mmCIF file of all heavy atoms in Angstrom:
data_model
loop_
_atom_site.group_PDB
_atom_site.id
_atom_site.type_symbol
_atom_site.label_atom_id
_atom_site.label_comp_id
_atom_site.label_asym_id
_atom_site.label_seq_id
_atom_site.Cartn_x
_atom_site.Cartn_y
_atom_site.Cartn_z
ATOM 1 N N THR A 1 9.636 -0.163 12.270
ATOM 2 C CA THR A 1 8.734 -1.273 12.565
ATOM 3 C C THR A 1 7.281 -0.805 12.630
ATOM 4 O O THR A 1 6.368 -1.526 12.227
ATOM 5 C CB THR A 1 9.089 -1.923 13.901
ATOM 6 O OG1 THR A 1 10.508 -2.048 13.999
ATOM 7 C CG2 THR A 1 8.468 -3.295 14.012
ATOM 8 N N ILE A 2 7.069 0.399 13.154
ATOM 9 C CA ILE A 2 5.723 0.957 13.255
ATOM 10 C C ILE A 2 5.164 1.297 11.870
ATOM 11 O O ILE A 2 4.014 0.985 11.556
ATOM 12 C CB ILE A 2 5.717 2.239 14.115
ATOM 13 C CG1 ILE A 2 5.927 1.868 15.585
ATOM 14 C CG2 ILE A 2 4.416 3.004 13.918
ATOM 15 C CD1 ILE A 2 6.191 3.050 16.483
ATOM 16 N N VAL A 3 5.985 1.939 11.047
ATOM 17 C CA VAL A 3 5.574 2.327 9.701
ATOM 18 C C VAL A 3 5.383 1.113 8.796
ATOM 19 O O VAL A 3 4.342 0.967 8.156
ATOM 20 C CB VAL A 3 6.617 3.272 9.037
ATOM 21 C CG1 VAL A 3 6.362 3.353 7.535
ATOM 22 C CG2 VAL A 3 6.554 4.669 9.675
ATOM 23 N N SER A 4 6.389 0.243 8.752
ATOM 24 C CA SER A 4 6.334 -0.942 7.905
ATOM 25 C C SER A 4 5.181 -1.871 8.272
ATOM 26 O O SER A 4 4.482 -2.372 7.389
ATOM 27 C CB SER A 4 7.665 -1.689 7.960
ATOM 28 O OG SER A 4 7.734 -2.500 9.111
ATOM 29 N N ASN A 5 4.976 -2.099 9.566
ATOM 30 C CA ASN A 5 3.877 -2.954 10.008
ATOM 31 C C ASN A 5 2.519 -2.292 9.751
ATOM 32 O O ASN A 5 1.548 -2.974 9.430
ATOM 33 C CB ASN A 5 4.015 -3.289 11.493
ATOM 34 C CG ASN A 5 5.008 -4.418 11.748
ATOM 35 O OD1 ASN A 5 5.285 -4.769 12.894
ATOM 36 N ND2 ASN A 5 5.548 -4.986 10.677
ATOM 37 N N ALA A 6 2.451 -0.968 9.887
ATOM 38 C CA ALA A 6 1.200 -0.244 9.647
ATOM 39 C C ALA A 6 0.828 -0.273 8.163
ATOM 40 O O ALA A 6 -0.348 -0.385 7.812
ATOM 41 C CB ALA A 6 1.328 1.188 10.120
ATOM 42 N N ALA A 7 1.835 -0.169 7.297
ATOM 43 C CA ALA A 7 1.621 -0.198 5.852
ATOM 44 C C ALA A 7 1.173 -1.593 5.412
ATOM 45 O O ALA A 7 0.204 -1.740 4.666
ATOM 46 C CB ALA A 7 2.908 0.189 5.127
ATOM 47 N N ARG A 8 1.884 -2.615 5.880
ATOM 48 C CA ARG A 8 1.558 -4.006 5.551
ATOM 49 C C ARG A 8 0.088 -4.279 5.877
ATOM 50 O O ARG A 8 -0.662 -4.820 5.063
ATOM 51 C CB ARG A 8 2.458 -4.951 6.356
ATOM 52 C CG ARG A 8 2.419 -6.423 5.935
ATOM 53 C CD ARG A 8 3.753 -7.113 6.232
ATOM 54 N NE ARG A 8 4.561 -6.326 7.158
ATOM 55 C CZ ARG A 8 5.882 -6.406 7.257
ATOM 56 N NH1 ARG A 8 6.553 -7.243 6.490
ATOM 57 N NH2 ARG A 8 6.539 -5.648 8.127
ATOM 58 N N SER A 9 -0.321 -3.879 7.075
ATOM 59 C CA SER A 9 -1.693 -4.071 7.520
ATOM 60 C C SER A 9 -2.689 -3.202 6.752
ATOM 61 O O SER A 9 -3.817 -3.616 6.504
ATOM 62 C CB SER A 9 -1.796 -3.775 9.017
ATOM 63 O OG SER A 9 -3.146 -3.794 9.442
ATOM 64 N N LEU A 10 -2.284 -1.993 6.380
ATOM 65 C CA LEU A 10 -3.178 -1.109 5.645
ATOM 66 C C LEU A 10 -3.480 -1.700 4.278
ATOM 67 O O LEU A 10 -4.640 -1.755 3.854
ATOM 68 C CB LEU A 10 -2.544 0.268 5.457
ATOM 69 C CG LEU A 10 -3.258 1.180 4.444
ATOM 70 C CD1 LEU A 10 -4.620 1.619 4.993
ATOM 71 C CD2 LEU A 10 -2.375 2.389 4.126
ATOM 72 N N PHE A 11 -2.425 -2.141 3.597
ATOM 73 C CA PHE A 11 -2.553 -2.713 2.255
ATOM 74 C C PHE A 11 -3.314 -4.042 2.222
ATOM 75 O O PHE A 11 -3.912 -4.400 1.204
ATOM 76 C CB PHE A 11 -1.164 -2.875 1.615
ATOM 77 C CG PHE A 11 -0.388 -1.585 1.519
ATOM 78 C CD1 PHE A 11 0.983 -1.564 1.743
ATOM 79 C CD2 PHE A 11 -1.035 -0.387 1.207
ATOM 80 C CE1 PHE A 11 1.699 -0.373 1.663
ATOM 81 C CE2 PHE A 11 -0.332 0.807 1.123
ATOM 82 C CZ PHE A 11 1.035 0.815 1.349
ATOM 83 N N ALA A 12 -3.301 -4.767 3.333
ATOM 84 C CA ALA A 12 -4.012 -6.040 3.401
ATOM 85 C C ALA A 12 -5.502 -5.801 3.634
ATOM 86 O O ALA A 12 -6.347 -6.576 3.180
ATOM 87 C CB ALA A 12 -3.439 -6.901 4.513
ATOM 88 N N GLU A 13 -5.822 -4.714 4.330
ATOM 89 C CA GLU A 13 -7.207 -4.371 4.621
ATOM 90 C C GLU A 13 -7.834 -3.630 3.447
ATOM 91 O O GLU A 13 -9.053 -3.649 3.271
ATOM 92 C CB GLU A 13 -7.272 -3.505 5.884
ATOM 93 C CG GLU A 13 -8.671 -3.315 6.447
ATOM 94 C CD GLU A 13 -8.691 -3.174 7.968
ATOM 95 O OE1 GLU A 13 -7.655 -2.772 8.552
ATOM 96 O OE2 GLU A 13 -9.753 -3.464 8.573
ATOM 97 N N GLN A 14 -6.991 -2.972 2.652
ATOM 98 C CA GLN A 14 -7.440 -2.217 1.479
ATOM 99 C C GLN A 14 -6.547 -2.584 0.305
ATOM 100 O O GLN A 14 -5.654 -1.829 -0.072
ATOM 101 C CB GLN A 14 -7.353 -0.711 1.745
ATOM 102 C CG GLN A 14 -8.144 -0.255 2.965
ATOM 103 C CD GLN A 14 -8.380 1.241 2.993
ATOM 104 O OE1 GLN A 14 -7.904 1.976 2.127
ATOM 105 N NE2 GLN A 14 -9.119 1.700 3.994
ATOM 106 N N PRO A 15 -6.777 -3.760 -0.287
ATOM 107 C CA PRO A 15 -5.969 -4.214 -1.423
ATOM 108 C C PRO A 15 -6.102 -3.375 -2.698
ATOM 109 O O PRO A 15 -5.239 -3.431 -3.575
ATOM 110 C CB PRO A 15 -6.416 -5.667 -1.629
ATOM 111 C CG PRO A 15 -7.773 -5.738 -1.037
ATOM 112 C CD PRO A 15 -7.819 -4.734 0.084
ATOM 113 N N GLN A 16 -7.167 -2.587 -2.798
ATOM 114 C CA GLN A 16 -7.368 -1.765 -3.986
ATOM 115 C C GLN A 16 -6.257 -0.737 -4.124
ATOM 116 O O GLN A 16 -5.976 -0.264 -5.228
ATOM 117 C CB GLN A 16 -8.721 -1.056 -3.936
ATOM 118 C CG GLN A 16 -8.814 -0.002 -2.851
ATOM 119 C CD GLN A 16 -9.355 -0.564 -1.551
ATOM 120 O OE1 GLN A 16 -9.348 -1.782 -1.333
ATOM 121 N NE2 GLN A 16 -9.830 0.321 -0.678
ATOM 122 N N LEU A 17 -5.624 -0.399 -3.001
ATOM 123 C CA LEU A 17 -4.538 0.575 -3.002
ATOM 124 C C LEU A 17 -3.325 0.093 -3.796
ATOM 125 O O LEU A 17 -2.679 0.882 -4.479
ATOM 126 C CB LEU A 17 -4.105 0.901 -1.566
ATOM 127 C CG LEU A 17 -5.106 1.631 -0.664
ATOM 128 C CD1 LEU A 17 -4.464 1.863 0.709
ATOM 129 C CD2 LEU A 17 -5.526 2.946 -1.302
ATOM 130 N N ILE A 18 -3.023 -1.199 -3.717
ATOM 131 C CA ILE A 18 -1.868 -1.737 -4.420
ATOM 132 C C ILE A 18 -2.203 -2.499 -5.698
ATOM 133 O O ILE A 18 -1.346 -3.151 -6.285
ATOM 134 C CB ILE A 18 -1.022 -2.638 -3.495
ATOM 135 C CG1 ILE A 18 -1.911 -3.646 -2.764
ATOM 136 C CG2 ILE A 18 -0.271 -1.776 -2.503
ATOM 137 C CD1 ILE A 18 -1.153 -4.889 -2.286
ATOM 138 N N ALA A 19 -3.453 -2.422 -6.128
ATOM 139 C CA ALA A 19 -3.859 -3.074 -7.365
ATOM 140 C C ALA A 19 -3.520 -2.088 -8.475
ATOM 141 O O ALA A 19 -3.496 -0.883 -8.239
ATOM 142 C CB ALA A 19 -5.348 -3.335 -7.353
ATOM 143 N N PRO A 20 -3.210 -2.580 -9.687
ATOM 144 C CA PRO A 20 -2.892 -1.622 -10.755
ATOM 145 C C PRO A 20 -3.924 -0.494 -10.849
ATOM 146 O O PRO A 20 -5.133 -0.731 -10.782
ATOM 147 C CB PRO A 20 -2.847 -2.491 -12.007
ATOM 148 C CG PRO A 20 -2.370 -3.816 -11.488
ATOM 149 C CD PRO A 20 -3.070 -3.972 -10.150
ATOM 150 N N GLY A 21 -3.431 0.733 -10.990
ATOM 151 C CA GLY A 21 -4.305 1.890 -11.068
ATOM 152 C C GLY A 21 -4.516 2.511 -9.695
ATOM 153 O O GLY A 21 -4.925 3.673 -9.581
ATOM 154 N N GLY A 22 -4.243 1.730 -8.650
ATOM 155 C CA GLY A 22 -4.398 2.207 -7.285
ATOM 156 C C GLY A 22 -3.387 3.291 -6.976
ATOM 157 O O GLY A 22 -2.328 3.358 -7.604
ATOM 158 N N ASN A 23 -3.698 4.138 -6.003
ATOM 159 C CA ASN A 23 -2.794 5.220 -5.652
ATOM 160 C C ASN A 23 -1.466 4.799 -5.016
ATOM 161 O O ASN A 23 -0.559 5.617 -4.897
ATOM 162 C CB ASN A 23 -3.498 6.226 -4.746
ATOM 163 C CG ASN A 23 -2.858 7.597 -4.814
ATOM 164 O OD1 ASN A 23 -2.502 8.184 -3.791
ATOM 165 N ND2 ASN A 23 -2.704 8.108 -6.031
ATOM 166 N N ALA A 24 -1.337 3.538 -4.611
ATOM 167 C CA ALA A 24 -0.081 3.069 -4.013
ATOM 168 C C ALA A 24 0.629 2.091 -4.944
ATOM 169 O O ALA A 24 1.626 1.475 -4.565
ATOM 170 C CB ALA A 24 -0.338 2.407 -2.653
ATOM 171 N N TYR A 25 0.103 1.956 -6.161
ATOM 172 C CA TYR A 25 0.676 1.068 -7.169
ATOM 173 C C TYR A 25 1.803 1.809 -7.909
ATOM 174 O O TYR A 25 1.709 3.010 -8.158
ATOM 175 C CB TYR A 25 -0.432 0.615 -8.131
ATOM 176 C CG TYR A 25 0.068 -0.029 -9.397
ATOM 177 C CD1 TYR A 25 0.644 -1.302 -9.380
ATOM 178 C CD2 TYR A 25 -0.010 0.644 -10.614
ATOM 179 C CE1 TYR A 25 1.136 -1.886 -10.547
ATOM 180 C CE2 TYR A 25 0.479 0.070 -11.792
ATOM 181 C CZ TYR A 25 1.052 -1.188 -11.750
ATOM 182 O OH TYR A 25 1.567 -1.723 -12.899
ATOM 183 N N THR A 26 2.848 1.064 -8.255
ATOM 184 C CA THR A 26 4.084 1.536 -8.901
ATOM 185 C C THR A 26 5.022 1.857 -7.732
ATOM 186 O O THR A 26 4.570 2.305 -6.669
ATOM 187 C CB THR A 26 3.940 2.818 -9.824
ATOM 188 O OG1 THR A 26 3.735 3.998 -9.033
ATOM 189 C CG2 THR A 26 2.804 2.652 -10.818
ATOM 190 N N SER A 27 6.309 1.587 -7.916
ATOM 191 C CA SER A 27 7.281 1.850 -6.856
ATOM 192 C C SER A 27 7.323 3.320 -6.399
ATOM 193 O O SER A 27 7.378 3.602 -5.189
ATOM 194 C CB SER A 27 8.673 1.409 -7.310
ATOM 195 O OG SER A 27 8.656 0.025 -7.576
ATOM 196 N N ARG A 28 7.275 4.235 -7.364
ATOM 197 C CA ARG A 28 7.297 5.668 -7.068
ATOM 198 C C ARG A 28 6.175 6.045 -6.098
ATOM 199 O O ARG A 28 6.396 6.774 -5.133
ATOM 200 C CB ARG A 28 7.168 6.480 -8.359
ATOM 201 C CG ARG A 28 7.676 7.922 -8.243
ATOM 202 C CD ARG A 28 6.883 8.886 -9.130
ATOM 203 N NE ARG A 28 5.678 8.265 -9.678
ATOM 204 C CZ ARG A 28 5.569 7.817 -10.927
ATOM 205 N NH1 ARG A 28 6.596 7.921 -11.766
ATOM 206 N NH2 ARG A 28 4.438 7.245 -11.335
ATOM 207 N N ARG A 29 4.969 5.551 -6.352
ATOM 208 C CA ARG A 29 3.845 5.871 -5.482
ATOM 209 C C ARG A 29 3.918 5.129 -4.143
ATOM 210 O O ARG A 29 3.514 5.668 -3.114
ATOM 211 C CB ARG A 29 2.530 5.585 -6.210
ATOM 212 C CG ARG A 29 2.310 6.524 -7.403
ATOM 213 C CD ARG A 29 0.835 6.843 -7.645
ATOM 214 N NE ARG A 29 0.108 5.656 -8.082
ATOM 215 C CZ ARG A 29 -0.198 5.386 -9.348
ATOM 216 N NH1 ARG A 29 0.163 6.230 -10.304
ATOM 217 N NH2 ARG A 29 -0.842 4.265 -9.658
ATOM 218 N N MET A 30 4.434 3.902 -4.147
ATOM 219 C CA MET A 30 4.571 3.141 -2.906
ATOM 220 C C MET A 30 5.618 3.834 -2.016
ATOM 221 O O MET A 30 5.389 4.054 -0.830
ATOM 222 C CB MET A 30 5.006 1.692 -3.199
ATOM 223 C CG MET A 30 5.275 0.848 -1.947
ATOM 224 S SD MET A 30 3.893 0.816 -0.764
ATOM 225 C CE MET A 30 2.839 -0.524 -1.464
#
């Protein structure tokens, strides 16, 4: 719950991370 909620909030505050080309984009990187 701590990790999942922290990630959800991180990605919402920094959407560039999950946008194509972002370092958290693609399942492998996520």
Side-chain angles (χ1 to χ4, degrees):
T1 317
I2 288 169
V3 165
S4 81
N5 279 177
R8 191 151 16 204
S9 173
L10 167 69
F11 302 142
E13 192 148 24
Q14 303 196 357
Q16 68 269 18
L17 294 180
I18 49 157
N23 204 233
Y25 166 71
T26 72
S27 299
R28 201 213 11 258
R29 294 213 293 260
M30 176 54 84

